[PDB]
């Protein structure tokens, strides 16, 4: 890719790969494109930085349906580190990527027998369970794993997503509360919890959804989803025929402020880039949904 | 000044002390890293530690969730749950000090540039046998100890973090302590008046539509 539609040094490629590693991006094609070149034409330049790149490129190639590079990287990693446990996990993932689940299960059982306090093998077994569509067994195994190993946020988020996919929202809301308690400075969790509470039930659930949408918008002022949700929840609560006058007028005031902010934001957006297609349209949405 | 010194002593006694102490400190750091420790923990220990951390985090940050969930978790944790190596670090310093005193002591090394009192003299002139010499002039061992003591900041700078220098108990007890600490905590919601705080001013839509939308990688 160097001198090929781009002009970057090997340091720039390494930094881009590291940044793609920090945030869990899953653009397999670009990762493979950069990684194969980095492995081939700059192997000696990287003193000790090639093993994590090997792992990342192998995973991306497995995701990209290109197994020759995966096998090459796996062979290199196995040759460098004999008897390691991460390499066994990679081998199991390669096995299960070809719809060979019994071998992966026996490999993970062997890993757990060698070391009983290992975490990745249990997660891979749960992934194997999920790959076959067996949702209830996966949920049960994930619940057992969380019972054994609490404080793992990835498992909590995965369980919340699985519960969302099954149209069971109370337990998903509980899991999102558990996630939000550890990370009170993250607006995305508040936004998702507000969405779940909006989708769950009726009046008090809508009140909590509005509260957490407001909290998410307070944490970050660039969150347009939070603003839209706040406006929609305020409008929904205002028109409910089982609310007192005080709550009705408070929600009307909230909706008016939200609509004004939305209109100002869309005017700001239209000022820079000239399209003028939604500023003429969002106003109609605001007008037709008034009161 | 008062004394006339041979340049050869400056060339061959001063620098080697500094080089030796510097590289000895570096070797000590690397060796300490090499055999620092090897610890293993059973599953119950880590599980209980994670449970304790979760309980502490609940106690600290229960003010960001609805009160009903906080008290639901507080009904839990109360009924069902809570109630159901150096020898090389220090000895080489003394050994090297003794070896240096053996193979280097016997001549004036250098002089500090500030006046001192007679109290300083017994410390800085271990090797010499004079009587009326001033306390500013130092011996070799005192110079070695001064060089050893004056390198902590240099080691912290040129080397990662700080090294190369000298300076639960019972699960049931911890469970009882956390049970007693958690019992006196009460919910105080932090979202009671968030709307009024939001309504005070317009949103900060400044400095958000600069630059340009990204097209591809790099």
């Amino acid at each position: 890719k160097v001198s090929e539609l781009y002009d970057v040094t090997w340091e720039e490629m390494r930094d881009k790969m590291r940044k793609w590693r920090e945030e869990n991006s899953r653009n397999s094609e670009q990762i493979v494109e950069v990684g194969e070149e980095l492995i081939n034409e700059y192997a000696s330049k990287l003193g000790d930085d090639i093993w994590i790149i090997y792992e990342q490129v192998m995973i991306a190639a497995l995701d990209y349906g290109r197994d020759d590079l995966a096998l090459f990287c796996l062979q290199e990693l196995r040759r460098q580190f004999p008897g390691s446990h991460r390499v066994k996990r990679l081998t199991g993932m390669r096995f299960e990527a070809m719809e060979r689940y019994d071998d992966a299960i026996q490999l993970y059982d062997r890993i757990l027998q060698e070391d009983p306090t290992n975490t990745a093998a249990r997660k891979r077994k749960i992934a194997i369970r999920k790959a076959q569509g067996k949702n209830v067994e996966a949920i049960r195994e994930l619940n057992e794993y969380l019972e054994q190993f609490v404080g793992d946020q990835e498992a909590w988020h995965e369980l919340a997503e699985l519960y969302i996919n099954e149209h069971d929202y109370a337990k998903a809301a509980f899991c999102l509360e558990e996630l939000m308690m550890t990370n009170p400075h993250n607006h995305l969790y508040c936004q998702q919890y507000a969405e779940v509470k909006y989708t769950q039930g009726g009046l008090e659930n809508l009140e909590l959804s509005r509260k957490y949408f407001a909290q998410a918008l307070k944490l970050n002022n660039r969150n347009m989803r939070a603003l839209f949700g706040l406006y929609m929840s305020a409008s929904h609560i205002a028109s409910n025929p089982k609310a007192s006058a005080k709550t009705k007028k408070d929600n009307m005031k909230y909706a008016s402020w939200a609509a004004s902010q939305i209109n100002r934001a869309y005017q700001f957006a239209g000022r820079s880039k000239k399209e003028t297609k939604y500023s003429l349209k969002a106003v109609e949405d605001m007008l037709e949904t008034l009161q | 000044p008062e004394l006339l010194l041979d340049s050869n002593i400056r060339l061959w006694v001063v620098l080697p002390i500094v080089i030796i102490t510097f590289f000895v400190g570096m070797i000590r750091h690397y060796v300490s890293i090499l055999l620092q420790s090897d610890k293993k923990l059973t599953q119950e220990q880590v599980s209980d530690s994670q449970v304790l951390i979760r309980s502490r985090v609940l106690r600290e940050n229960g003010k960001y969730i609805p009160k009903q969930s906080f008290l639901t978790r507080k009904y839990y944790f109360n009924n069902p749950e809570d109630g159901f190596g150096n020898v090389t670090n220090v000895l080489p310093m003394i050994l090297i000090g003794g070896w240096i005193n053996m193979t280097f002591s016997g001549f004036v090394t250098t002089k500090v540039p500030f006046p001192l009192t007679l109290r300083f003299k017994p410390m800085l002139q271990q090797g010499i046998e004079l009587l009326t010499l001033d306390a500013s002039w130092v011996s070799s061992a005192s110079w070695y100890f001064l060089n050893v003591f004056g390198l902590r900041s240099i080691y912290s700078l040129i080397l990662g973090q700080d090294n190369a220098a000298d300076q639960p108990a019972d699960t049931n007890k911890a469970f009882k302590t956390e049970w007693e600490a958690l019992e006196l905590t009460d919910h105080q919601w932090a979202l009671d008046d968030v709307e009024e705080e939001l309504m005070a001013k317009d949103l900060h839509f400044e400095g958000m539509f600069k630059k340009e939308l990204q097209t591809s990688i790099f």
């Binding site: 969380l146 369980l159 | 008290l71 944790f77």
Partner: peptide, 21 residues
């Protein structure tokens, strides 16, 4: 609010339901 509106309807450690004022 009107027209387009969709209603989707259908034991992780601690889970309680009632009272505790």
């Amino acid at each position: 609010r009107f027209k387009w509106a969709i209603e989707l309807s259908g034991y992780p450690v601690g889970y309680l339901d009632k009272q505790v004022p």
